[PDB]
């Protein structure tokens, strides 16, 4: 009751089970997944989507049941000399499967290359940083998101 | 495959298609443009830069482009005289159109 009655959370929309009927259920297990995403591409968290982050670092199955909750937390992350805390990898690799959680940070690129360093022309370093230093950006503010399940 | 596997190509960059899948999806008609340029001046041949060749000579568009190839050819272009037969445009008065 309190979570849906809470207006401090910017976004609370989910399906599989209607929120009003959640007060009468006794499901087996509850998963609490939390991470940080930019204010943009938040809708990509929903399953059956396609995008830079959705298909690559957190994919949800089409048989998913549970809810997604996101709220703004730009009061303690930005307005300083940079943030540089929350990394990510770019459009690379060979796509994702729902619920892997794979971390194999390594240097690779097409073009018949060896593995020695960065070497901008042939290879790249996959991961880089977010930037929320500007106060600008409705979809650039450092939002925080959690995803429950059933 | 004969051109892809050859090691004589210093640079082989493909746009919109990964090089080893072109034998699958077949396109209706292709093109083969050709010319001679410097070594450090190769990089102007790309979708939307600005230099001496991307504005006043053969210029790529912002649309789809295929695979651009280059290699070193100092073997048969040499000697004291210098191949002065080569020439380029350096006094154009306005920008160009894709494939002018």
């Amino acid at each position, epitope marked *: 009751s309190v979570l849906y009655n809470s207006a401090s959370f910017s976004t609370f929309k989910c399906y599989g089970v209607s929120p009003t009927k959640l007060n009468d259920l006794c499901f087996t297990n509850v998963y609490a997944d939390s991470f940080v995403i930019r204010g943009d591409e938040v809708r990509q968290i929903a399953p059956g989507q396609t995008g830079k982050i959705a298909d690559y670092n957190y994919k949800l199955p089409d048989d998913f049941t549970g809810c997604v909750i996101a709220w703004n937390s730009n009061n303690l992350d930005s307005k300083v*000399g*940079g943030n*540089y805390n929350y990394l990510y990898r*770019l459009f690379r690799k060979s796509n994702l499967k729902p619920f892997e959680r794979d971390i194999s940070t390594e240097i690779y690129q097409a073009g018949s290359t060896p593995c020695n*360093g*960065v070497e*901008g*022309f*042939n290879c*790249y*370093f996959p991961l*880089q*940083s977010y*930037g929320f*230093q*500007p106060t600008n950006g409705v979809g650039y503010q450092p939002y925080r998101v959690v995803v429950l399940s059933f | 495959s004969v051109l892809y596997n050859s090691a004589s190509f210093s640079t082989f*960059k493909c*746009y919109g298609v990964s090089p080893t899948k072109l034998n699958d999806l077949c396109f209706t008609n292709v093109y083969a443009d050709s010319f001679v340029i410097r070594g450090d001046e190769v*990089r*102007q041949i*790309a*979708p*939307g*830069q*600005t*230099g*001496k060749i*991307a504005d006043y000579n053969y210029k790529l568009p912002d649309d789809f482009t295929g695979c651009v190839i280059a290699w070193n050819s100092n073997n048969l272009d040499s000697k004291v005289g210098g191949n002065y037969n080569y020439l380029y445009r*350096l*006094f*154009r*008065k*306005s*920008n160009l159109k894709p494939f002018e």
Partner: antibody
Amino acid sequence: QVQLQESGPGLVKPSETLSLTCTVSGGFIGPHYWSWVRQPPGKGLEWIGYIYISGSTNYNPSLKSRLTISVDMSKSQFSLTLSSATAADTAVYYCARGGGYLETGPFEYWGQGTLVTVSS
Amino acid sequence: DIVMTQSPLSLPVTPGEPASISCRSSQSLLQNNGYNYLAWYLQKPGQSPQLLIYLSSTRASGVPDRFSGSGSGTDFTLKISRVEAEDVGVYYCMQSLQIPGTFGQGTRLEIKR
């Protein structure tokens, strides 16, 4: 080798046209873009714009309403004209040789520098 | 516009040991080519700026081979293997991906004695 050099007035009245000239010596006509750049006192550097040999040019959007630039092949000189200036434009002006033409921006050579002051 | 940032703003370094200056960007710097465009200038007191690094990995003519850079995307780093008496000045980093091209605040290197 190329040795750039500026010349012009030092004091200008407010809301008056500003004229300078960066003469180029040594390396003559060629396929090289030329630019201009300035520096507020005790601050960072500010690039203005670049001009080609033929005359085609692109401008900084902030200063695209009251600034002009040309070229003259015979005298190996190019000039910068800035009109309706304010006191905020008092700075030192450098003329470059490479040009930051959104491609590589190799600033291969820089000038000595000229200081201009805006006052009545 | 895109704004450059550096860290720190002042740096005291004793001769002999390597140093490092970082310049972080606000937008991805990687054109349609495999190249990433960047520059690093050096302004000694009382003189005009000079070029040290362009394309972030190729030196300029006549520059001593002690300076180098690396990184791609939005992170780059310049290092000086051995500082000397003439390395007193203010360093800048330029982006040149698209118009306009603006510099940074300018790191001040200090030499100790």
